[model samples]
Target: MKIVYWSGTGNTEKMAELIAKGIIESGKDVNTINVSDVNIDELLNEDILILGCSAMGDEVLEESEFEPFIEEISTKISGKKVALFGSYGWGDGKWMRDFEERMNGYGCVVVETPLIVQNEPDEAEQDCIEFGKKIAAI
Candidate 1:
């Protein structure tokens, strides 16, 4: 399994790290990397794709890199099991909800209910960790 994420203020990055830890605890091998550094071919080979990106302007995905990467991989990711997560400073979890819908449209079975944290992810740390354990089981 691989976790590819984008974090503007590091909140989402921390979530990815914690999730990776949980996967390790569950006795699974996991790789956590930044979205920019990800190799699509390598990601595609994994049984599960764990992706995170904090919400951006008006509760949307980071535009410059994450959004485009998602678009590029949309067609190729059908039937893939995915775990989506992110951090947002404002609004409800609309972005995450929309993201879940989009992933389902792509025929990707989202193994977990998309995780979202308000800010630093400090309080939601355990939830993120537990989420990874669940993904590992899937």
Candidate 2:
């Protein structure tokens, strides 16, 4: 399993670190990385792909880099096992849901519904912690 994410406010980043810890607790070789450092080839070899990103303008992904990264990995994610977690400021969890929908549309096993948090206070924080442990156990 491998976890990948993009974060600006540090909320999602903190969530990611603990989840990575959970994965490690379960004895899995999973680690988290910032999106900028990720390579398309790395996504192909992972047994599980855990991805996180925060909402941007109007409740969407951080378009500058994250969205394009999604497009880059889009074609290769089909049939893959995935889990999504992220932080948002003022919207309903629309961004996370939409992202989950897009991934599901491509036949990827979402593993669980999108984990969303407000202001990165930590659904997507503490909740992400528990969720991460859940998958790590599986």
Candidate 3:
């Protein structure tokens, strides 16, 4: 299992770390990489892929390095088991919905509804950890 993430203002990075901790505790092979650091070939080798990023303008994916990375992988991700988590400071969490829909449209098997945090992860971060364990087990 590999958790690939992008963080703006550190929220999503913390989520990725917590989730990785849970995966390690579950005794599974896990790698947590920033989206900018991920190699497409290495990503393709993973059994499960977890993506995290914060919402940007108009409730969209962060337009910096993360969005471009996702665009590069979108078509290549078909048939992969994937999950998404993100932090949003405002809006109704529509960004996660749109992202999940895009992944589903690309034929990725989304493990569950995206875990979206308001500001940062509070109790929701724990849910992300458990969800990571669940998807890794699958």
Candidate 4:
């Protein structure tokens, strides 16, 4: 399993860590990476994809890097099993909802409900853990 994410204030990054821990607890190994350092080819080879990114600028993904990366991999990741998670500062989780819809449009099977937390991810640590375990099962 792989977790690829972009975190501006470390919140999403923390979510990735907790999720990774949960996967490990569920008897699986996981590699977590920042989107900036991701190896595209390697990521594509995985059976499961775990992605994290916070809502930004009016309920949207971080446009500068994460969005572009998604665009690059979207065409190729069709039919892949995926789990989506992130943290948000304000507004409803329209970003996560839209993200799930977009992944569905790309033909990816989102194996779990998209996880969203407000501000920091600590408040949702348990949820992240449960989400990770479910994803590992998938």
Which candidate wins on lDDT? 4
Kindly list the per-residue Cα lDDT of model 1 for residues 63-117, writing each as its tens digit. Answer: 9999999999999999999999988886888889888999999999998888888
TM-scores of all models? Answer: 0.97, 0.91, 0.93, 0.97
After TM-score superposition, the amount by which residue 42's alpha carbon in candidate 2 deviates from its true location, in angstroms, is 1.7
RMSD, every candidate, angstroms: 0.8, 1.6, 1.2, 0.9
- Pitting candidate 2 against candidate 3, the one with the higher lDDT is 3
Model 4: per-residue Cα lDDT over 45-85, one tens digit each: 99999999999988999999999999999899889998899
Better of 3 and 4 by lDDT: 4
State residue 10's C-alpha deviation in candidate 1, in Å.
0.3
Error of 4 at 84 (Å): 0.4
Evaluate residue 99 in candidate 4 and report its C-alpha lDDT on the 0 to 100 scale: 96
- What C-alpha lDDT does candidate 3 achieve relative to the native structure? 0.84
Candidate 3 per-residue lDDT over residues 1-138, each given as its tens digit: 788888878888888888887788788878889887888997898767799988888888889788898889887888998889888886888888999998999899998778788877787878878876776677
Q: Higher TM-score: candidate 3 or 4?
A: 4
Overlapping backbone residue pairs in candidate 4 total: 0
Candidate 2 lDDT tens digits, 9-110: 788888788788777776777768899988879677987788999888887888988899988888888889998988788788888989999888877899
For residue 108, give model 1's deviation from the true position in Å: 0.9
- Residue 29 CA error for candidate 4 (Å)? 0.8
